Amino acid sequence: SEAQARRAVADIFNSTLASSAIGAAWELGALDELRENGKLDVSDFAVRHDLHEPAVVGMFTALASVGIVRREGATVVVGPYFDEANHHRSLFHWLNQGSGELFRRMPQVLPNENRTGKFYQLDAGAISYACREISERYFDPAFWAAVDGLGYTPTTVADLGSGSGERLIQIARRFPGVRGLGVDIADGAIAMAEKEVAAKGFGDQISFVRGDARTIDQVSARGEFAEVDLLTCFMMGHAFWPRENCVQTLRKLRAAFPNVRRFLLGDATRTVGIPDRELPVFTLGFEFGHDMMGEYLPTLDEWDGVFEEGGWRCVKKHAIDSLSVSVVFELE
């Protein structure tokens, strides 16, 4: 019926604003205040954060329009979808603040004749902001379980796609005296990581080399790769694909880190068979986004079927809770 359609299309429209507002409300500290108190005063919030109050009210209204919060007079209170939306806030942030410009330019990204050079734009800083919580909230538990199951004590750990350096710092805290080596293709991430590690007191223990993990055989790192006995690779593995490339990169890693015992590999994957109206959070954005960008994304089964050919054996596998289909593999 018409009334139902009217309401469903309106919710579609409003969900757009609520979606953008989830990431924004995280970044600006509102979701944390509402989690800690169950409520807040909108004027007081606007004043304590020095925000444009009409826009703040707009922000909470968007959230309220689809049931994440409820507005009661001067006040905003948690609504029925608050816990679920707050749980997944970093994915909304990734979708909007990080990737929004990609999805927005859909009419300009889809034509074949535009798809050369730098045909889309991501907000790298925003993506990094979101990936920090995505790594801790969804991957940390399986990561540390894999670490707890190593069967040895690492002495030098190399992290591929090292980013901010956080993972290497956490391993260094777990295992006093371990040395770390982070490889990242982006000179900007090398510089940020170097700064963080120095600031946190791990400058003499953790180093960084700029390098492409897909051509790890070309990376010059003072002969340190041969000392590495734990290898880690989180949220970037899909970059090794398509399959023939992935097989060669896996062999190359096997030869460049010949004293690696365990290789812990964590990523999100492309799903198969999920009915359109049942797609869970993230899955559609991650896949559609990689398809817009022209980047390969393997399924779980494709990973499972590549290891042996690539020179590794999967000895344990961990399911991630609610990040589309995501896994951590323990390879040796």
Ligand X SMILES: O=C(O)[C@H](O)Cc1ccccc1
Ligand Y SMILES: Nc1ncnc2c1ncn2[C@@H]1O[C@H](CSCC[C@H](N)C(=O)O)[C@@H](O)[C@H]1O
Q: By C-beta, is 131 or 190 nearer to ligand M72?
A: 131
Per-residue exposure over 263-298, b if at least 16 CB sit within 10 Å of its own CB, e if not: bbbbbbbbbeeeeeeeeebbbebbbebeebbeebbb
Q: Tell me how far CA of residue 285 lies from CA of 80, 103, 122, in angstroms.
A: 24, 9, 13
Give CA–CA dist 102/119, Å, rounded.
Answer: 9
Q: Is 293 in the site for ligand Y (CB under 6 A)?
A: no
Q: By C-beta, is 171 or 236 nearer to ligand M72?
A: 236
- Tokens representing residue 18 in the block: 């609520």
218 interacts with, out of its own copies, Ca ion, ligand X, none, CB within 5 to 8 A per kind: Ca ion
Question: To the nearest whole angstrom, how small is the minimum distance from the Cβ of residue 91 to ligand Y?
Answer: 14
Question: To the nearest whole angstrom, how small is the minimum distance from the Cβ of residue 230 to its own copies?
Answer: 35
| Structural contact between residues 260 and 230, judged by C-beta atoms closer than 8 angstroms | yes
Q: By C-beta, is 22 or 213 nearer to ligand Y?
A: 213
Q: Binding to its own copies (CB under 8 A): which residues in 50-79?
A: 50-52, 54-59, 61-62, 64-68, 70-71
Q: By C-beta, is 212 or 304 nearer to ligand Y?
A: 212
Q: Is 197 in the site for ligand Y (CB under 6 A)?
A: no
Please give the radius of gyration of the chain, using alpha carbons only, rounded to the nearest integer: 22
> How is residue 241 annotated by DSSP?
-
| Structural contact between residues 292 and 111, judged by C-beta atoms closer than 8 angstroms | no
Q: Is 282 in the site for its own copies (CB under 8 A)?
A: yes
Question: To the nearest whole angstrom, how small is the minimum distance from the Cβ of residue 316 to ligand X?
Answer: 5
Q: Is 206 in the site for ligand Y (CB under 6 A)?
A: no
- Tokens representing residue 154 in the block: 């690492």
When binding is defined by CB under 6 A, the residue of 21, 147, 235, 268 that contacts ligand Y is 235
Q: Is 127 in the site for its own copies (CB under 8 A)?
A: no
